[PDB]
Amino acid sequence: MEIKLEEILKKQPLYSGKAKSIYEIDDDKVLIEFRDDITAGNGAKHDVKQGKGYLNALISSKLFEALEENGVKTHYIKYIEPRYMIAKKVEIIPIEVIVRNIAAGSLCRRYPFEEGKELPFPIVQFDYKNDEYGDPMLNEDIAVALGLATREELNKIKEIALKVNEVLKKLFDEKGIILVDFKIEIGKDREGNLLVADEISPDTMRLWDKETRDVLDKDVFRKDLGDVIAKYRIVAERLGLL
Amino acid sequence: MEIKLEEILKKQPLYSGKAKSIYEIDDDKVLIEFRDDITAGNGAKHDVKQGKGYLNALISSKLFEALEENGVKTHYIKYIEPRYMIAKKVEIIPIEVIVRNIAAGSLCRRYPFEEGKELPFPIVQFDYKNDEYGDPMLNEDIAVALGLATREELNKIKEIALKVNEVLKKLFDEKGIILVDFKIEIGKDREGNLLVADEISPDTMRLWDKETRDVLDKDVFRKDLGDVIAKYRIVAERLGLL
Ligand SMILES: Nc1ncnc2c1ncn2[C@@H]1O[C@H](COP(=O)(O)OP(=O)(O)OP(=O)(O)O)[C@@H](O)[C@H]1O
Ligand SMILES: Nc1ncnc2c1ncn2[C@@H]1O[C@H](COP(=O)(O)OP(=O)(O)OP(=O)(O)O)[C@@H](O)[C@H]1O
Questions:
Q1: Is any Cβ of chain B less than 8 angstroms from the Cβ of A136?
Q2: Is A141's Cβ below 8 Å from some Cβ in B?
Q3: N or C end of chain A, less CB within 10 A?
Q4: Residue A99 burial (CB < 10 Å; 0-12/13-18/19+)?
Q5: Which DSSP letter does residue B133 get?
Q6: Which residues from chain A sit within 8 angstroms of residue B120, using beta carbons?
Q7: Residues of chain B neighbouring A129 (CB-CB closer than 8 A)
């Protein structure tokens, strides 16, 4: 007994996106509901798949706990089955932070990188979160001129990104999974601390089986590669969450 | 009695681009011919305007001489009227270096910047020079991972771009002209020195009259604003080259 889940869900979400609903708990905490909605191509492709929110909330809680254990400060407070998460309320910085270990996705489409090729070092990419503009890639000068964050913050965010990568890449490799790349969102809590927020799940990470390189993330849905839920379940399974 | 110009021109160009032809003089020097061809939208729009090569070579020679006088090392050796330039031969780094003082062009199209609005500081943008990929914008990590240049070179290139900007912006302001932005190319000479190469002309700079903000650069041609050659000539006039 700590939060009145059933009563909070009866309220109107402070915000409702394409995959999750944010409900208010109090002044500094929110209830995050992982829905069964799954999207691709920026909304262009959508469906509702049973067990998606359950698996993503489950995996995300585990990765956050792993990060916290390694000193990475996050918005995670606790997991409430099957698809809810209690988190510290933050003000999200409109920047998609992408870290890449293997060339894939837009990197290969936009530059002469061979898909599946190991990168010399983890590439960090900042994208402007703005639908009207198609989420264009940013460089440090532009983000600062746009007033999205200060130079020092942008660099701190990059360091957090690389630390997150270090923790996760190792964790998944031990579980026979290759962390191809991932995207995180950072936000400032009531005290102004920079916290990894949002989620960290197969919806936000590219994960390939180490042996076969079978796709285990949302790309399965984007490119209709097979049973996405069954693959998401393999991830949870590998992490020992089932 | 300089180089054997008339004889050099009879030779097949080492390279011919959309606006200039590169002829070999010797092992470490080249003759650069500014043609009258003018293009926009990546070759999609083209024309031949008498006097363009003459005006751009004339202006570029003057700007290079100004940069050299301020310590910026360039490939410029001497100007041969009406449209030729003797330059140190260099290996061009496939990166388009853009510096912006005022928001315009792609900056306003890709991000929520107000056109004509003064930027808080000179924004430096690196674009990958590659037709097959549409010259995508780069960030430091991508450029290095692609092997275009070392991190140290990239930062050295940025320092150069900003010094160039400092010199040119002041020069044009004294001549009643606002240097909105510009794009330069860097190359390595026989000794490995990083030199500002190619050209610096109304074809590569956005220049607006200080009082009226009338466009004086190639945008006049891109958007059919009027007599492009007459405007280019105004730039030459202001610089006292006519
Ligand atoms: N701790 C938090 N406090 C406040 N808002 C949060 C927190 N964590 C994540 N959010 C926001 O929850 C919203 C809904 O998630 P989703 O529904 O995942 O968003 P989108 O994916 O619809 O928006 P993004 O594409 O996330 O802007 C996102 O806009 C995200 O920034
Ligand atoms: N000092 C130099 N030595 C060797 N090559 C040079 C030198 N200066 C510029 N160049 C090259 O000469 C070409 C100029 O022709 P342009 O007609 O200017 O080419 P593009 O139109 O092919 O230019 P991009 O190639 O668009 O810069 C460019 O490809 C440029 O990189």
A1: yes
A2: yes
A3: N
A4: buried
A5: G
A6: 144-145
A7: none
Taking Cα atoms as reference points, which of A37, A28, A26, A34 lies closest to residue A4?
Answer: A26
Q: How far apart are CA B151 and CA A112, in angstroms?
A: 19
Report the residue count for chain A.
242
Q: Does A110 touch chain B (CB under 8 A)?
A: yes
Q: Is the CB of A14 under 6 A from ligand 1?
A: no
Q: All domains of chain B, ordered by start, with CATH? A: 1-90+228-242 (3.30.200.20), 91-227 (3.30.470.20)
Task: Using the mean position of ligand 1's atoms as its centre, give its distance from the Cα of residue A198 in Å.
Answer: 6
As a whole number of angstroms, the distance between CA A207 and CA A178 comes to 6
- Nearby residues of A232 by Cβ (< 8 Å), 6 or more positions away: A51, A52, A55, A56, A59, A201, A202, A216
State how far the Cα of B174 lies from the Cα of A217, in Å rounded to an integer: 58
**Which position has the token pair 């100007």?**
B79
Cβ(A187)–Cβ(A199) below 8 Å: no
| Any ligand 1 atom below 6 A from CB of A185 | yes
- Please name the residues in contact with B207: beta carbons below 8 A apart, sequence gap of 6 or more: B172, B177, B178, B179, B180, B215, B216, B217, B235
Give the method used.
X-ray
